[PDB]
RNA sequence: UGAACUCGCUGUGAAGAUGCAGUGUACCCGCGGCAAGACGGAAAGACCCCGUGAACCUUUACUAUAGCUUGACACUGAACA
């Protein structure tokens, strides 16, 4: 398939570029994820009328707003006293859903799926290093204290 | 249930005769019995053979097929070795 872009996606292709791709990749995940479109002579044609002098301002703020949201919180300890056994050994294992409350509880917008982890679970007591996704360009390393 | 004025023997005869030949006996007709014969009645022999007949059934008969299994291509992608 070939298809023009809208997004700095990683490998295939670079902004307002007409890559031909599997047609999978382009069917179930550009076109629903936002960042490409069908390379029809009217889409191309339609893109260089007008859209290309406006993606890419909205990918310089796009990056922005993720500057922003990255830099609002990065005191890197936000403080959840979940359930927990003795010495280690925590009650019941800790989902990204909870991590994601509790840095809305205190800080940033930052939803479920905009959360990266190495484990996932946290299943004991301490400093557990989080990272973040709130964009596939940009991360974030705001850690957690969980306690008893 | 062809029609009957439907005896016995010996012989002849699709080769085991109430019906032919030869011969012996028997008046016409019931009734109650028996059941040897009328190749008695019943059922186009059920064993056998024939049909370039049928059915089912078996299998290492033939040719197929549902199924189960194999691989290519599609639905079907991204990276990295
Ligand atoms: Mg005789
Ligand atoms: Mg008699
Ligand atoms: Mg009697
Ligand atoms: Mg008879
Ligand atoms: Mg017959």
Same mark, same amino acid.
């Given at each position: 398939?070939?298809?023009?872009?809208?997004?700095?996606?990683?490998?295939?292709?670079?902004?307002?570029?007409?890559?031909?791709?599997?047609?999978?990749?382009?069917?179930?995940?550009?076109?629903?994820?936002?960042?490409?479109?069908?390379?029809?002579?009217?889409?191309?044609?339609?893109?260089?009328?007008?859209?290309?002098?406006?993606?890419?301002?909205?990918?310089?703020?796009?990056?922005?707003?993720?500057?922003?949201?990255?830099?609002?919180?990065? =005191?890197?300890?936000?403080?959840?006293?979940?359930?927990?056994?003795?010495?280690?050994?925590?009650?019941?294992?800790?989902?990204?859903?909870?991590?994601?409350?509790?840095?809305?509880?205190?800080?940033?917008?930052?939803?479920?799926?905009?959360?990266?982890?190495?484990?996932?679970? =946290?299943?004991?007591?301490?400093?557990?290093?989080?990272?973040?996704?709130?964009?596939?360009?940009?991360?974030?390393?705001?850690?957690?204290?969980?306690?008893?």
């Amino acid at each position: 398939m070939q298809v023009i872009l809208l997004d700095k996606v990683a490998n295939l292709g670079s902004l307002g570029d007409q890559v031909n791709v599997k047609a999978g990749y382009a069917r179930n995940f550009l076109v629903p994820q936002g960042k490409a479109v069908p390379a029809t002579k009217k889409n191309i044609e339609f893109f260089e009328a007008r859209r290309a002098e406006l993606e890419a301002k909205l990918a310089e703020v796009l990056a922005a707003a993720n500057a922003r949201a990255e830099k609002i919180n990065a =005191l890197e300890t936000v403080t959840i006293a979940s359930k927990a056994g003795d010495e280690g050994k925590l009650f019941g294992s800790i989902g990204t859903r909870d991590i994601a409350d509790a840095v809305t509880a205190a800080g940033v917008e930052v939803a479920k799926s905009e959360v990266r982890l190495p484990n996932g679970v =946290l299943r004991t007591t301490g400093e557990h290093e989080v990272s973040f996704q709130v964009h596939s360009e940009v991360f974030a390393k705001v850690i957690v204290n969980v306690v008893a």
